[PDB]
Design a protein around this nucleic acid. Structure first.
Ligand SMILES: [Mg+2]
Ligand SMILES: [Mg+2]
Ligand SMILES: [Mg+2]
Ligand SMILES: [Mg+2]
Ligand SMILES: [Mg+2]
Ligand SMILES: [Mg+2]
Ligand SMILES: [Mg+2]
Ligand SMILES: [Mg+2]
Ligand SMILES: [Mg+2]
Ligand SMILES: [Mg+2]
Ligand SMILES: [Mg+2]
Ligand SMILES: [Mg+2]
Ligand SMILES: [Mg+2]
Ligand SMILES: [Mg+2]
Ligand SMILES: [Mg+2]
Ligand SMILES: [Mg+2]
Ligand SMILES: [Mg+2]
Ligand SMILES: [Mg+2]
Ligand SMILES: [Mg+2]
Ligand SMILES: [Mg+2]
Ligand SMILES: [Mg+2]
Ligand SMILES: [Mg+2]
Ligand SMILES: [Mg+2]
Ligand SMILES: [Mg+2]
Ligand SMILES: [Mg+2]
Ligand SMILES: [Mg+2]
Ligand SMILES: [Mg+2]
Ligand SMILES: [Mg+2]
Ligand SMILES: [Mg+2]
Ligand SMILES: [Mg+2]
Ligand SMILES: [Mg+2]
Ligand SMILES: [Mg+2]
Ligand SMILES: [Mg+2]
Ligand SMILES: [Mg+2]
Ligand SMILES: [Mg+2]
Ligand SMILES: [Mg+2]
Ligand SMILES: [Mg+2]
Ligand SMILES: [Mg+2]
Ligand SMILES: [Mg+2]
Ligand SMILES: [Mg+2]
Ligand SMILES: [Mg+2]
Ligand SMILES: [Mg+2]
Ligand SMILES: [Mg+2]
Ligand SMILES: [Mg+2]
Ligand SMILES: [Mg+2]
Ligand SMILES: [Mg+2]
Ligand SMILES: [Mg+2]
Ligand SMILES: [Mg+2]
Ligand SMILES: [Mg+2]
Ligand SMILES: [Mg+2]
Ligand SMILES: [Mg+2]
Ligand SMILES: [Mg+2]
Ligand SMILES: [Mg+2]
Ligand SMILES: [Mg+2]
Ligand SMILES: [Mg+2]
Ligand SMILES: [Mg+2]
Ligand SMILES: [Mg+2]
Ligand SMILES: [Mg+2]
Ligand SMILES: [Mg+2]
Ligand SMILES: [Mg+2]
Ligand SMILES: [Mg+2]
Ligand SMILES: [Mg+2]
Ligand SMILES: [Mg+2]
Ligand SMILES: [Mg+2]
Ligand SMILES: [Mg+2]
Ligand SMILES: [Mg+2]
Ligand SMILES: [Mg+2]
Ligand SMILES: [Mg+2]
Ligand SMILES: [Mg+2]
Ligand SMILES: [Mg+2]
Ligand SMILES: [Mg+2]
Ligand SMILES: [Mg+2]
Ligand SMILES: [Mg+2]
Ligand SMILES: [Mg+2]
Ligand SMILES: [Mg+2]
Ligand SMILES: [Mg+2]
Ligand SMILES: [Mg+2]
Ligand SMILES: [Mg+2]
Ligand SMILES: [Mg+2]
Lengths: 210, 147
RNA sequence: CGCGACCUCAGAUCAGACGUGGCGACCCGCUGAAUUUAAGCAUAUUAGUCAGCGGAGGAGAAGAAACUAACCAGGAUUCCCUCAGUAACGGCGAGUGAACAGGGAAGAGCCCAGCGCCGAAUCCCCGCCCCGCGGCGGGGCGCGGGACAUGUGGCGUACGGAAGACCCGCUCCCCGGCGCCGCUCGUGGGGGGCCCAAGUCCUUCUGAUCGAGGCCCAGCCCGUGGACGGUGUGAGGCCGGUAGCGGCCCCCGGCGCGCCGGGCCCGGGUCUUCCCGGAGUCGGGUUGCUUGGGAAUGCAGCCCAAAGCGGGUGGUAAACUCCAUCUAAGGCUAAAUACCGGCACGAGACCGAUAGUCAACAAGUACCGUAAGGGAAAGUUGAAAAGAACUUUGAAGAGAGAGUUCAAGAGGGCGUGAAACCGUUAAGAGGUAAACGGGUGGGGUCCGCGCAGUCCGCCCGGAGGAUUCAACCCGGCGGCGGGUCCGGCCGUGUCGGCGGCCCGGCGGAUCUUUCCCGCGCGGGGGACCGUCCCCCGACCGGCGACCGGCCGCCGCCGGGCGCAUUUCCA
RNA sequence: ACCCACCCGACCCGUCUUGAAACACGGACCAAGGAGUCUAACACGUGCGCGAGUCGGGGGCUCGCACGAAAGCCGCCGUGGCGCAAUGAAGGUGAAGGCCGGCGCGCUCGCCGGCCGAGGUGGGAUCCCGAGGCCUCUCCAGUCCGCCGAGGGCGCACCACCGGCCCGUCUCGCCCGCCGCGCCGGGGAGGUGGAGCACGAGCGCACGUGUUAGGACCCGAAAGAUGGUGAACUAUGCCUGGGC
RNA sequence: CGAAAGACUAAUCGAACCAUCUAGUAGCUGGUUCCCUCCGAAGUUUCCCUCAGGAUAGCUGGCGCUCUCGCACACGCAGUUU
RNA sequence: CGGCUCGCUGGCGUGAGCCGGGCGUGGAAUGGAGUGCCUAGUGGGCCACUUUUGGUAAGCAGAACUGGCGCUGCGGGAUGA
RNA sequence: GGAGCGUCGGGCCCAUACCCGGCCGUCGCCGGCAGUCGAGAGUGGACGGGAGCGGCGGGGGCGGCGCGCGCGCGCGCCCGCCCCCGGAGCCCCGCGGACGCUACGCCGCGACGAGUAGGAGGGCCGCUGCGGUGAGCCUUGAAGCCUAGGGCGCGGGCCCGGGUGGAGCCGCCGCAGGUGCAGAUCUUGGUGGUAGUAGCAAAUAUUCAAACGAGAACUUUGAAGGCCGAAGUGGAGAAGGGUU
RNA sequence: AAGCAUCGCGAAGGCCCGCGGCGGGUGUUGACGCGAUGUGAUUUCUGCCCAGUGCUCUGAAUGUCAAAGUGAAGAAAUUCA
RNA sequence: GAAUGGAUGAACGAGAUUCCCACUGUCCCUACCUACUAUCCAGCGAAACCACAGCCAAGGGAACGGGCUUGGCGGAAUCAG
RNA sequence: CACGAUCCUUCUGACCUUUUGGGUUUUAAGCAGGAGGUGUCAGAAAAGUUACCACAGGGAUAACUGGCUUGUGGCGGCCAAG
RNA sequence: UGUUCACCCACUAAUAGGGAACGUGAGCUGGGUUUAGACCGUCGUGAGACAGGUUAGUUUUACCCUACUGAUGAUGUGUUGU
């Protein structure tokens, strides 16, 4: 029974919730377990990056996130092809590869290409035997580092470009932004019906002849 | 702290602060928000006017990120930039006016509340209000739409 | 009316395999209520929940888009945070109620059918040899059987693939064994075994001490060890342990090198010619259930029943139209995740024998019920049994002495031993049931006294005895306070050095790519601004932030001062 | 405080009840047990930290955890939450005004330069100014120190009122704008709806009270559902025996 | 199951027993544990398938805040009266 | 008193709203006021004076006004809400 | 000839009401005190010239704002001074300040004090466990238990003595709760009164002797008297029991 | 309870069980039978009522009556016939 | 009031009534006798129930008190009833 | 005095909004005002019976007694026309 | 006649009226009301109903206190008896 002003509120404790309460006394032991596991994998994959493979730069979907940039899942096939890395092989040198990524814009492609280029430059391929064949790097770049890379390999930093203080040309001052948006809105709204009226008018002009 | 709670003081007293005429029975109203329309009607219709009944349009698969459009007022537009843009300007003597990309700092619309200081600015934003535009023009600046 | 192929079907204690039940915390597949809420109740809710049935594994399920989206776009599953108590559902009431994006944990991707090419190039079982044999395997050799063309194997699967011509660059990957080397993170992987510091030192309590005091520095000794337990009380040093990149011994794992036996002639780009997708399935109607899914989210039965620039999706039914996006009707897949059952450990601001599990004990026991099922109570002598020899009364149970024990005023259901209740002993009372509140009195019990309690403390006066100083200086030490801020250290506000500025660093959407390095961007310089530090002078708050001299005062020690002082005592 | 005496007073507690010593119920006696809890959500109050921010989770980095499942740190420091902006069913829109001078006919309308910059009335703790006293051991001069202070001012917070601005909505009206001159877009005046603005007050944590959802202060039904055990009693059928 | 009494179905029958769902729900009985100190009610309102109950006003408490001046120098308010 | 504003109202004037000055105890008696949040219990009542409806009446039923009891002992009414 | 009734006197009796006083608490005082003069307070103090018994020659007001303990004064000698608390000696002392001052302390004046349901505050009230802390306590005796012993507190309670007991336990500051019982026809265990009471009454029956034996109404043997009266109180089985 | 009297059924049936079955009981049955009701030996009777509620018989001569199917317009959902 | 059966009816009934004969302690109206109890003892030995308890009259009171007020009064411990 | 909320339905209204990747058209959904009704009229959708009965409670409430009352019943006066 | 009440017969001196929880169920009885079985009538579609009739249908405990009835005793009087 409610009493004089409050939030008319609906708690969801009508099911047998105490049968399904999930406590969190694990979490410390969990965190430790995860960190132990993590340290094991690092030790197994000896001079490899603990991180895992190198992953692509990617824009977030939707108007909201839009401006940000993330790690993606793996490098697209078009990107690998441009870099000159055979798709089956890329996985063996520590390059993530999805083949589900389309590639719409050239701007995203080239930046990702640049990534793989950079990676190949700063990567130290050990030879299969200790007796060295082609590709495998020199024994100098080997002794100086069989080192792991702590943290994500070649990390992504969502970065901005500075603009120098301009002067504002008279034309720029002149721009009627708010108004411009409103117009554009209405043109989008009305584009379809305007087009229909035009089609009707053209039909009337042709109908006048016959 | 049980130590600090009430029931410690009520030891001894029979009814335990619930009165002996009407008792602390189990559920005298009805459980929860029962009786909004009958018998708790007054409460609901002098502290929650508008609870009952439908209104407006349904909208089935709403997704909030489409309608994402955070706002910033002119009031504190210069707060976006480091003071030394606002300082190196009101100086300089070129009539330069620095750029304030609003979208970088996490706002899409530039609304019109507040006095802007007499000091030109190029403001890059996704949308503007009418008044917010007019103010910037009067300061001696330029609105810049951006996708 | 034979004999022979195959096809479909039988029978065998035929040869050799497998399945059957259990457990069930977690997991998958069905099935599926009603108490309950709505203040009534029927839809709703409880709830796809309990009960029911099935099937698993160390995890399961899920999983490599017929996906999200509508962006400048993301890109298997699972898990956490968030989205969100939101969009939505709902006698639009009660109530219910997701997803995408974003950030993390983890991260792994693949294989068929088909379409095609390759003398079935494939598989299973026999039998003989060499190795290997406690997870039946390798190699060889058999006109030895069968499976298979109603389709086995290699290539190949939408990320495209195949086959060709010439551009390029060159040739290690796997397993069956047999060895051998480095014992390979809780800092020598796993298991097992056996080991490893220092007081029983002096006194003294005690039934017994692990107590109390002492012991070349809180006392002795060790301390990478002062966790815990045991031992006749409370123990770092009595014993087990504890600590330690401590030791030794076994076994086992895992990885490193060598030899052998086999397999294995395994690329990439560039141009051409070909090749390409899972049907009673989708989709539609429908009825029923289900969902937040609303003119149908998902799953069903029934009826209809496809296509191939098709098909699906694009959260309001439909037609027309452009766009976007996946490729369904076959399959495998570790990881983060779950875990009130199991085995084996660790811990606790929990409980402490009517508690905590039903169960600290011969507890799922005794006992009850035809049966399904129900289901208890019940811990403690003492350090040690030293558990009462012997005498005596009694048919004996029971006593009386004696004895053990620190104690039986601990005697085998025995630690402590409350209350109700009862026996007795002592005192006091007693015809209005008792008991009670207030007020006195009488009697008892002990408790404080006094064999004067005249209680002390200052100061003073007297008369007796008593040692040494106060006062005064001198020498030393220590402390206080003071200003001259006197001299120097110390720091606040200001000004001067632009002096640290590069020998002062960080920060910055300030600038410059005249610079440097790496690839218009990143890193580093280089300017600039903000902030933090040296040099000396001046003014001022001269601040408990300190030193040094000087002054004045105080105190202590040591000298002197012998008695009109000096305390003591009665 | 143990007992006894006497005078005066004095009915048995708990409870529901207008009313209990009640011919109302519970209660022979003693021991031990025994009932407002925890979680979540909200609200207001209070304490602390930071403040247009705040925040900590979740995760990660630091240890074999003796004490640690702590403590510390993190361009994760902020993905994100809450807050900093509302209002409309929605498409959407989105909180400034004044003054001065000039130019358009100042047209209480439209455009261009300068200055001030969150309006005003009343009331407001409090600050500020202050005529004037009031003396000083003398007659006057006369700086210093107060005490009071009539009278006048700036006026926090807060309240009341009047203006103003934003969003919805209506009524009436006249002008502007351009890549797209259009069933385009933008304004004005006056009403009226808003959980609005009008120089910010939140966020986190902790404690309290209250209200809920949960076993929900403790004990209490008659019922309802699911799955199982029974015809050794008894009901009735059948089979096979016995008896009068 | 009943030659019918709602009889009988293991001392149980107008729906057996056992376990679970289950701590089922109760506007209704009963109970609800120490001390002192200060304040101290209500049984009336409207609404309710409401009349042994809730809601809402009222009456209570708590926390406060804003001012006032016995600091020779007061405004406002009242279960009065004029 | 003096003056400004009006799109209201109007032969001129009204009426309202604004500024700017000029004037102080304006019946008795009493008392410090104002204001905002959280908020429990309660929502069976009964009794007496006077008024009063139903009823022959009632220790009956039902209203008004105040005061009681309920929540409250104490003196008196022997006894007693 | 009231101890009756009506009218009236004096006198006296006593409530928790009224008055005065004590003590406890609560509320209120812009309450006081971090160390100062001062009781209708209505000033204090430089400092300069000019001077001195002058003063400020204002109301039957009955008076407050001015007057008779001095202003200048006694000493040094008309001139100088009118001096310093490390010393005026103090009723006021501004040079420094409690015996007092855990400022959550201490102190002073008033007023007031019923209370169910209910609310709030304070508990050096009480229970159990944790972080701190008491160079705490304890076999030279902890907890618990008992006590016609001594005390404290309004009270919750607490402290001491004696006894018993035989191993652990407490004070303070914080934190935490499965934290306080007379009741619930409460739960479990124990004990009363009832009470040496109701009762040990269905189916005819016993008696004498001996034996054994500590002991005989009841065992056994003998004797006598009785019953069951072959549809048996006889002799055998079934089921059920399970060693009888 | 005998006796009386009604009713259904000729087996792909009546009546009835069952979650389901080319399932089962009556039924190893066939109207002198099986099933469903009433009344209640014998004797003697058993009147009237088919309006009501039941049950049943007939059925293109026919009001309504669903899903499908048929036509209709519509771009289609569709609506109308 | 007519197989919701009406009217009848020998035989039968631990069925329901009424009267008569006989018989009787059913009664007038009670008495006596027997057995087993109760009773007393030895031995053994429960329970229900219990706020405290236990003499009355009247009063008032929740309108019938053991307790309260005012009166009457009150004498251990028990036995069978 | 002569009348009626949410939800649903229906009608009317605007060159109105949405119908979700975009556009045209149907359709549907919105926004604003009427109407379809809840007479238990602040608004559930609802018939009996129980003597076979059950449970929670109630002296808030009947069926006795006892209280008050005494209309009615019973008993008794006054007055005095007869 | 279950009756209270009623009526009648008979006797009588008279066959007056009442109260005590409408005295009196651990005093009885249980005939009647007033469970369950059944019958009839009326009512009800029906289950069922009927201050309409009928028949069949468990009447517990005293040993406590008091009261009363009887029975031992009690304090006093030195003890004892008369
Ligand atoms: Mg990772
Ligand atoms: Mg109380
Ligand atoms: Mg309360
Ligand atoms: Mg109560
Ligand atoms: Mg209540
Ligand atoms: Mg009530
Ligand atoms: Mg199995
Ligand atoms: Mg309900
Ligand atoms: Mg309910
Ligand atoms: Mg119900
Ligand atoms: Mg559901
Ligand atoms: Mg289950
Ligand atoms: Mg799997
Ligand atoms: Mg697949
Ligand atoms: Mg996803
Ligand atoms: Mg949120
Ligand atoms: Mg649900
Ligand atoms: Mg093939
Ligand atoms: Mg030990
Ligand atoms: Mg030890
Ligand atoms: Mg050792
Ligand atoms: Mg559902
Ligand atoms: Mg659509
Ligand atoms: Mg799978
Ligand atoms: Mg025990
Ligand atoms: Mg026990
Ligand atoms: Mg136990
Ligand atoms: Mg115990
Ligand atoms: Mg025990
Ligand atoms: Mg014991
Ligand atoms: Mg014990
Ligand atoms: Mg002892
Ligand atoms: Mg002992
Ligand atoms: Mg013990
Ligand atoms: Mg003992
Ligand atoms: Mg005794
Ligand atoms: Mg005696
Ligand atoms: Mg009472
Ligand atoms: Mg009574
Ligand atoms: Mg009761
Ligand atoms: Mg009782
Ligand atoms: Mg207890
Ligand atoms: Mg707060
Ligand atoms: Mg609240
Ligand atoms: Mg609760
Ligand atoms: Mg229950
Ligand atoms: Mg039900
Ligand atoms: Mg019956
Ligand atoms: Mg409960
Ligand atoms: Mg109720
Ligand atoms: Mg009640
Ligand atoms: Mg009444
Ligand atoms: Mg009351
Ligand atoms: Mg009080
Ligand atoms: Mg011991
Ligand atoms: Mg606890
Ligand atoms: Mg108790
Ligand atoms: Mg006897
Ligand atoms: Mg015989
Ligand atoms: Mg025999
Ligand atoms: Mg026999
Ligand atoms: Mg018939
Ligand atoms: Mg007939
Ligand atoms: Mg008919
Ligand atoms: Mg008839
Ligand atoms: Mg008839
Ligand atoms: Mg009584
Ligand atoms: Mg489309
Ligand atoms: Mg009946
Ligand atoms: Mg009846
Ligand atoms: Mg009952
Ligand atoms: Mg009553
Ligand atoms: Mg009566
Ligand atoms: Mg009677
Ligand atoms: Mg009687
Ligand atoms: Mg009786
Ligand atoms: Mg009878
Ligand atoms: Mg009957
Ligand atoms: Mg007897």
């Amino acid at each position: 029974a409610p009493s004089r002003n409050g939030m008319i509120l609906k708690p969801h404790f009508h099911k047998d919730w105490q049968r399904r309460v999930a406590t969190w006394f694990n979490q410390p032991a969990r965190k430790i377990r995860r960190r132990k596991a993590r340290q094991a994998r690092a030790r197994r994959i000896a001079p490899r990056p603990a991180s895992g493979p190198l992953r692509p730069i990617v824009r977030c979907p939707t108007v909201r996130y839009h401006t940000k940039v993330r790690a993606g899942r793996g490098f697209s096939l078009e990107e690998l092809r441009v870099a000159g890395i055979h798709k089956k092989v890329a996985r063996t040198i520590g390059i993530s590869v999805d083949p589900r990524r389309r590639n719409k814009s050239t701007e995203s492609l080239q930046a990702n290409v640049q990534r793989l280029k950079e990676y190949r430059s700063k990567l130290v391929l050990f030879p299969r035997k200790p007796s060295a064949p082609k590709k495998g790097d020199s024994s100098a770049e080997e002794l100086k580092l069989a080192t792991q890379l702590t943290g994500p390999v070649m990390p992504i930093r969502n970065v901005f470009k500075k603009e120098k203080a301009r002067v504002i040309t008279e034309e720029e001052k002149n721009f009627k932004a708010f108004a411009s948006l409103r117009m554009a809105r209405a043109n989008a709204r009305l584009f379809g019906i305007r087009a229909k009226r035009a089609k009707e008018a053209a039909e009337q002009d042709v109908e006048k002849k016959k | 702290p049980s130590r600090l709670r009430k029931t410690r003081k009520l030891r001894g007293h029979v009814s335990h602060g619930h009165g002996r005429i009407g008792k602390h029975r189990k559920h005298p109203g009805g459980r929860g928000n029962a009786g909004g329309m009958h018998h708790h009607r007054i409460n609901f219709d002098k502290y929650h006017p508008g609870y009952f009944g439908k209104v407006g349009m349904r909208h089935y698969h709403l997704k909030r990120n489409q309608s994402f459009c955070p706002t910033v007022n002119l009031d504190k537009l210069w707060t976006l930039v480091s003071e030394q843009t606002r300082v190196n300007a009101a100086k300089n003597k070129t009539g330069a006016a620095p750029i304030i990309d609003v979208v970088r700092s996490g706002y899409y619309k530039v609304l019109g509340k507040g006095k802007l200081p007499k000091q030109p600015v190029i403001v890059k934003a996704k949308f503007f209000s009418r008044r917010a535009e007019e103010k910037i023009k009067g300061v001696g600046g330029a609105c810049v739409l951006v996708a």
